[PDB]
Design a protein around this nucleic acid. Structure first.
Ligand SMILES: [Mg+2]
Ligand SMILES: [Mg+2]
Ligand SMILES: [Mg+2]
Ligand SMILES: [Mg+2]
Ligand SMILES: [Mg+2]
Ligand SMILES: [Mg+2]
Ligand SMILES: [Mg+2]
Lengths: 188, 67, 36, 128
RNA sequence: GCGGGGUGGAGCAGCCUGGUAGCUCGUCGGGCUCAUAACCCGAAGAUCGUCGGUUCAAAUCCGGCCCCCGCUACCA
RNA sequence: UGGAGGUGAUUUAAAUGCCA
RNA sequence: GGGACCGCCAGUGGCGAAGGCGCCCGGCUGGAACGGGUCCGACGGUGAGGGCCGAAGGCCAGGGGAGCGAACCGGAUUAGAUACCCGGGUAGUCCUGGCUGUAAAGGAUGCGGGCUAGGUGUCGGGCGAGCUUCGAGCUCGCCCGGUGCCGUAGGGAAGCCGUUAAGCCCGCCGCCUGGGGAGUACGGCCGCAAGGCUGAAACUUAAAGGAAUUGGCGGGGGAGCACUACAAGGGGUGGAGCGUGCGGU
């Protein structure tokens, strides 16, 4: 029916700090409806190196100035197939979840996951979690929202846990599993 | 409507009463023209035959480890 | 009720869980109807 | 650019099969087909043939409105019920690219609880 | 107020939309089984309460009437 | 050679039996 | 917006007197193992009568109620179906305050001490050698304490137990005396009610029970067969009339 013919294709754009690039097309009648639609594109669709194909990003639009949907970072997540294969018997996963804030005033919740190399005690398992909290909060003091996110998904906080914790028990594959923004600064 | 296929190997006897035979055919003119699939036939079959079929996509379910 | 496990054995009889339930329904009548 | 893409949600259980073709955001549908909309016997409504036909009549009407490729999302009922996809999943994915579309990444998104609520039956199952 | 049921051993279908008197428990015979119950098959059984009209032609449209009736009470 | 646990599944209806 | 539960890692692994206990961070609190030329100086074992703790369910009062679901209302299956299967659903299940005191509450195995071959895993502590990307890390050996398996002497009717004894000894307490009648009648003490604890006789009966052995059978599992089995096919008997055998009359 004509209902399809009244539609209109809009071009979505990545945020600024990932490089403004085209991401998908999208139909609708009036722009007042394309205003909270959530996209999802893997990291490799933006400056793609085949290795990080298993990291996914979320962008939510906030403006339509004439066939251009500018977005805003919303979250970040690994893929269940990926982490479904790091957890085997005799390996003792370790799980941390933190509420933090940044310079602009954004509030975030990061969920990082370490994976020891054998079976270990638990009083030796919470020392590691305290280490992780202590190098997350710190790292979230001099870095703004846009630079914290730039390296969380990138993999520049993993190489710091994987340094200070390997001196508790030799581990493998420490990394960050999920990010979700919670609130905005009232300013701006 | 006309797709012929040329048997290359027999796999065994399926059937509630030993009637049908599973066999690995190779299409020879049409959409695939070279692909290899698996189908059940009724009647007797040697190798080198030419069946005529009508879909070219059904891929009969695997048999009990051929025995 | 001071039970004895020789009677759950079901060989030449009926279930014990259902015999107890029938002894109770008689002790309820010998009590109401002038078990006073 | 001019490259339209989309998503295909494929919902399959022991009793039916639904194919849904939407645009890349996910919020504007294009084509939605089921299994009881083609076959007539409630026996084979979940069969592989029903999926194979519905998944063709979906692609047909979705290719005419411009879509060139499609990503895959396969789903089972999941939750407090079965977690294994029925017989229509591998059949619908295999007869969606044979119909002219391309195929990007695939994944399964069945909902899983971290020790959630209670199933049916009760302490003794379905003593059929 | 006067009207309804009128039909196999039975129970009721079965009308207006006319040409198989219709399905079920029963009855005798045959199958299946080692044999009995259940299950499958075949025949027998009222021929529509009855005269009459309509109708080429009627449980099938209805009237006259024979039977059983049937919803109902002292009316100072 | 030989055993002990765990999780899954397990399919229409289908009763009964002189006397020695 | 809303109530309940915390998956994979999860391990004949850990902790507790038993029932039991599984997201993370902080505070209060009980018990055990190991290391000890520490301290007191027999203070100990068991325990009739008494005392606290005790799954699920039911009860009495106030809240809460998402999922599931006794009673209850409908659809089917069947000769019948008050059931199994399907669609709904009240009490319950959850929180605060009390009462009841029961389970296949099972290692079907009460608790303390001494002694009588080995082998092999795994959790906590200590010691001693080797490595070491100098990590609260990885291997190997010995001593102590929990937790599994194979197995000598001996024990047992056998199944099987065997330093975590069902072995040989020194203590203390509870219960048993053929099967039923019967955990019933009568009488007491508890509980709001349901119900708990205590508990006989008349009479009847020759067996009731346990562990193993040959067989037969299974709407249990594997292997193999057969036109008095099927599948693929050819001809028919069952309906009519006669030939002949049988039941009945
Ligand atoms: Mg005993
Ligand atoms: Mg019979
Ligand atoms: Mg059955
Ligand atoms: Mg029998
Ligand atoms: Mg006492
Ligand atoms: Mg129900
Ligand atoms: Mg227990």
């Amino acid at each position: 029916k004509d209902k399809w013919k009244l539609k209109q294709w809009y071009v979505i754009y990545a945020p600024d700090f990932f490089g403004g690039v085209e991401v998908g097309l999208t139909p609708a009648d009036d722009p007042e409806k394309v205003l909270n639609r959530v996209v999802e594109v893997t990291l490799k669709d933006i400056t793609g190196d085949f290795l990080k194909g298993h990291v996914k990003l979320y962008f939510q639009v906030y403006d339509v100035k004439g066939q251009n949907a500018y977005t805003k970072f919303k979250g970040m997540k690994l893929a269940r197939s990926y982490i479904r294969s790091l957890v085997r018997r005799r390996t003792t996963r370790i799980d941390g979840i933190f509420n933090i804030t940044t310079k602009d005033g954004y509030k975030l919740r990061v969920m990082a996951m370490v994976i020891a190399a054998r079976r270990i005690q638990t009083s030796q398992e919470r020392a590691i979690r305290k280490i992780m909290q202590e190098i997350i909060y710190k790292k979230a003091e001099e870095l703004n929202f846009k630079d914290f996110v730039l390296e969380a998904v990138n993999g520049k906080i993993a190489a710091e846990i994987a340094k200070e914790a390997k001196k508790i028990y030799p581990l493998k594959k420490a990394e960050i599993r999920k990010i979700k923004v919670l609130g905005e600064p009232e300013v701006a | 409507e006309g797709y012929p296929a040329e048997v290359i190997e027999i796999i065994g006897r399926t059937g509630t009463t030993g009637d049908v035979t599973q066999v690995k055919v190779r299409i020879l003119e049409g959409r695939d023209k070279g692909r290899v699939i698996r189908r059940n036939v009724r009647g007797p079959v040697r190798v080198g035959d030419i069946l005529i079929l009508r879909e070219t996509e059904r891929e009969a379910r695997e048999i009990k480890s051929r025995r | 009720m001071k039970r004895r496990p020789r009677k759950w054995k079901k060989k030449g009889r009926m279930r014990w869980k259902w015999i107890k339930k029938r002894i109770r329904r008689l002790k309820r009548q010998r009590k109401k109807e002038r078990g006073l | 650019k001019k490259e339209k893409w989309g998503i295909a949600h494929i919902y399959s259980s022991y009793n039916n099969t639904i194919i849904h073709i939407t645009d890349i955001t996910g919020a504007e549908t294009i084509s939605r087909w089921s299994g009881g909309m083609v076959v007539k016997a409630d026996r084979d409504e979940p069969s592989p043939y029903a999926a194979m036909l519905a998944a063709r009549r979906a692609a047909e009407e979705a290719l005419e409105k411009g879509i060139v490729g499609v990503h895959i999302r396969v789903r089972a009922p999941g939750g407090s019920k079965s977690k294994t996809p029925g017989p229509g999943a591998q059949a619908a994915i295999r007869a969606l690219a044979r119909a002219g579309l391309k195929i990007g990444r695939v994944e399964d998104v069945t909902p899983i609880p971290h020790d959630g609520t209670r199933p049916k039956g009760g302490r003794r199952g379905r003593r059929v």
